[PDB]
Amino acid sequence: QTIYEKLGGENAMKAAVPLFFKKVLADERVKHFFKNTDMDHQTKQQTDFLTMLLGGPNHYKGKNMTEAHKGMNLQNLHFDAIIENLAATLKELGVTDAVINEAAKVIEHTRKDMLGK
Ligand code: HEM
């Protein structure tokens, strides 16, 4: 069983990513980083990245997490906000706390790759 399957597979991921962006783009700590972002493109990259990271098909062709956030000098409070919004998204979509934690635990390894770049 992969975390991707536990979350409900492809239709669940396609629902979760725009709901995660709806919470990110409402969060004072991080919404402004997206001011000039093409959000259709970013929906596709982020769906492909999370799907690959959580054990679904690997079709991610984007940048690595240092390149993706290069020159943003992101701080720990920004990464906490992204995790909090993904957790709130998956909870609103009916995922149990155990599965949200498994997913967060994988994503958390990316923190050192993108902070302070
Ligand atoms: C730490 C707070 C974070 C902020 C403020 C943030 C913000 C951003 C922004 C502004 C861009 C794109 C610049 C543009 O193309 O318009 C980007 C690219 C990306 N971010 Fe983040 N991100 C953060 C954390 C995360 C996390 C935790 C992940 C994955 C778990 C992630 C995955 C990505 C991916 C896949 C891209 C796309 C790279 C590509 O287009 O090739 N980010 N991010």
CA of 63 to the centre of ligand 1 (A): 9
Domains of the chain by start residue, with CATH: 1-117 (1.10.490.10)
Question: Which tokens belong to 38?
Answer: 């093409």
Contacts of residue 61, defined as CB under 8 A and 6 or more positions apart, other chains included, come to: 48
Taking the centre of ligand 1 as the mean of its atom positions, its distance from the CA of residue 7, in whole angstroms, is 21
Indicate the DSSP class of residue 18.
H
DSSP-based three-state secondary structure for 65 = helix
Method: X-ray
C-beta 51 within 6 A of ligand 1: no
To one decimal, the resolution in angstroms is 1.8
Task: Take atom 34 of ligand 1 and give the residue whose Cα is closest.
Answer: 46
For the Cβ of 62 lying below 6 angstroms from any atom of ligand 1, the answer is: yes
32 is in an annotated binding site: no
Whether the CB-CB separation of 106 and 82 falls below 8 Å is answered with no
Distance CA 115, CA 77 (A): 10
Amino acid occupying residue 49:
F
CB 13 within 8 A of CB 7: yes
Amino acid at 97: D
- Match 């629902």 to its residue by tokens: 15
Q: Is the CB of 16 under 6 A from ligand 1?
A: no
